[PDB]
Write an enzyme that holds these catalytic residues in place. Structure first.
Site, PDB file in Angstrom:
ATOM      1  N   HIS A  40      12.403  10.486  -4.371  1.00  0.00           N
ATOM      2  CA  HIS A  40      12.705   9.498  -5.368  1.00  0.00           C
ATOM      3  C   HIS A  40      11.433   8.827  -5.894  1.00  0.00           C
ATOM      4  O   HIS A  40      11.522   8.079  -6.892  1.00  0.00           O
ATOM      5  CB  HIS A  40      13.748   8.472  -4.881  1.00  0.00           C
ATOM      6  N   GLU A  52      -6.827   2.753   2.017  1.00  0.00           N
ATOM      7  CA  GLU A  52      -6.565   1.471   1.461  1.00  0.00           C
ATOM      8  C   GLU A  52      -6.144   0.427   2.503  1.00  0.00           C
ATOM      9  O   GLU A  52      -5.351   0.705   3.391  1.00  0.00           O
ATOM     10  CB  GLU A  52      -5.415   1.526   0.443  1.00  0.00           C
ATOM     11  N   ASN A  54      -6.367  -3.687   1.145  1.00  0.00           N
ATOM     12  CA  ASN A  54      -6.025  -4.465  -0.037  1.00  0.00           C
ATOM     13  C   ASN A  54      -5.993  -3.537  -1.237  1.00  0.00           C
ATOM     14  O   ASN A  54      -7.054  -2.983  -1.634  1.00  0.00           O
ATOM     15  CB  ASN A  54      -7.018  -5.593  -0.276  1.00  0.00           C
ATOM     16  N   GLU A  62     -11.995   3.477   0.620  1.00  0.00           N
ATOM     17  CA  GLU A  62     -11.045   4.211  -0.187  1.00  0.00           C
ATOM     18  C   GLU A  62     -11.537   5.627  -0.559  1.00  0.00           C
ATOM     19  O   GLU A  62     -12.715   5.865  -0.748  1.00  0.00           O
ATOM     20  CB  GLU A  62     -10.785   3.478  -1.510  1.00  0.00           C
ATOM     21  N   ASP A  84      15.660  13.583   0.581  1.00  0.00           N
ATOM     22  CA  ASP A  84      14.728  12.723  -0.096  1.00  0.00           C
ATOM     23  C   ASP A  84      13.319  12.894   0.433  1.00  0.00           C
ATOM     24  O   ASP A  84      12.761  12.066   1.178  1.00  0.00           O
ATOM     25  CB  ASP A  84      15.184  11.252  -0.011  1.00  0.00           C
ATOM     26  N   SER A 172      12.251  -2.393   5.862  1.00  0.00           N
ATOM     27  CA  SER A 172      11.474  -1.956   4.715  1.00  0.00           C
ATOM     28  C   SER A 172      12.144  -2.452   3.439  1.00  0.00           C
ATOM     29  O   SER A 172      13.288  -2.893   3.453  1.00  0.00           O
ATOM     30  CB  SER A 172      11.298  -0.443   4.741  1.00  0.00           C
ATOM     31  N   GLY A 175       9.095  -0.747  -2.869  1.00  0.00           N
ATOM     32  CA  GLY A 175       7.690  -0.494  -2.844  1.00  0.00           C
ATOM     33  C   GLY A 175       7.162   0.102  -1.555  1.00  0.00           C
ATOM     34  O   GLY A 175       6.057   0.674  -1.526  1.00  0.00           O
ATOM     35  N   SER A 177       9.003   2.585  -0.314  1.00  0.00           N
ATOM     36  CA  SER A 177       9.535   3.903  -0.613  1.00  0.00           C
ATOM     37  C   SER A 177       8.496   4.970  -0.404  1.00  0.00           C
ATOM     38  O   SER A 177       7.391   4.857  -0.941  1.00  0.00           O
ATOM     39  CB  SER A 177       9.915   3.983  -2.106  1.00  0.00           C
ATOM     40  N   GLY A 178       8.854   6.028   0.296  1.00  0.00           N
ATOM     41  CA  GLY A 178       7.983   7.168   0.484  1.00  0.00           C
ATOM     42  C   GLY A 178       7.041   7.080   1.644  1.00  0.00           C
ATOM     43  O   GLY A 178       6.454   8.083   2.033  1.00  0.00           O
TER      44      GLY A 178
HETATM   45 CA   LIG Z   1      -8.661  -1.317  -1.752  1.00  0.00          CA
END
Ligand SMILES: [Ca+2]
Length: 223
Positions: A40, A52, A54, A62, A84, A172, A175, A177-178
């Site tokens: 989805h 990541e 922040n 990163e 899914d 959860s 956002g 999601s996944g």
């Molecule tokens: Ca960052």
């Protein structure tokens, strides 16, 4: 994540952010070239953001790598959310290190009562909205299939499990999601769906990754 805690920077080194101008979904790094997420979460134009904490500040660890290909499960049904799961291949291999690392696939399914770690940049409120910048974490148990089915009559397939707290308060949310559900060092779930977030008798529902390991391996081997 509602009712969780700040993970700590780069303490969840397999957690990815999927970015299309903005964070829109989580995912899990499973080797240097592939991410597992929810079907989805499919869209074109995905940049995978590894390392990541922040998501609004460049902090130094990163790796931003565009997706070359996404593969939604052949049998994904967007109405029911059955199957899914989606794979995303990176245009170039990530550089793996202590802060950017793959998570192992399961060798067998997990059982009810197993403690897992759920993480993401989703909403932290159960009523209302607040989106964190740093990664949030929740320790939560897998719930029995019978309690899961009772919570969501007619909706839980053999490709889904519930995890969390029937009392509510900890879950959860949008956002997340996944993103990952990791249990004893194995990716057992993907954040899939629920009724609101952190509501009594409405635990989160997760894709049952152990059912998909053969598909994941064979897809990677030929793509
Ligand atoms: Ca960052």
């Amino acid at each position: 994540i509602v009712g969780g805690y700040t993970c700590g920077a780069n303490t969840v080194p397999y957690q990815v952010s999927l970015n299309s101008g903005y964070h829109f979904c989580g995912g899990s790094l499973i080797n240097s070239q592939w991410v597992v997420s929810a079907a989805h979460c499919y869209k074109s134009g995905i940049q995978v953001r590894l390392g990541e904490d922040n998501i609004n500040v460049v902090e130094g660890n990163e790796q931003f790598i565009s997706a070359s290909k996404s593969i939604v499960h052949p049998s994904y049904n967007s109405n029911t959310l059955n199957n899914d799961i989606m794979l995303i291949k990176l245009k170039s291999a990530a550089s793996l290190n202590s802060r950017v690392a793959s998570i192992s696939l399961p060798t067998s399914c997990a059982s009810a009562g197993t403690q897992c770690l759920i993480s993401g940049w989703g909403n932290t409120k159960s009523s209302g909205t607040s989106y964190p910048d740093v990664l949030k974490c929740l320790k939560a148990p897998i719930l029995s299939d019978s309690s899961c089915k009772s919570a969501y009559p007619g909706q839980i397939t053999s490709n889904m499990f519930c995890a969390g707290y029937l009392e509510g308060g900890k879950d959860s949310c949008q956002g997340d999601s996944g993103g990952p559900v990791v249990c004893s060092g194995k990716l057992q779930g993907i954040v899939s769906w629920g009724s609101g977030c952190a509501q009594k008798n409405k635990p989160g529902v997760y894709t049952k990754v152990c059912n998909y390991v053969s598909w994941i391996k064979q897809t990677i081997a030929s793509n």
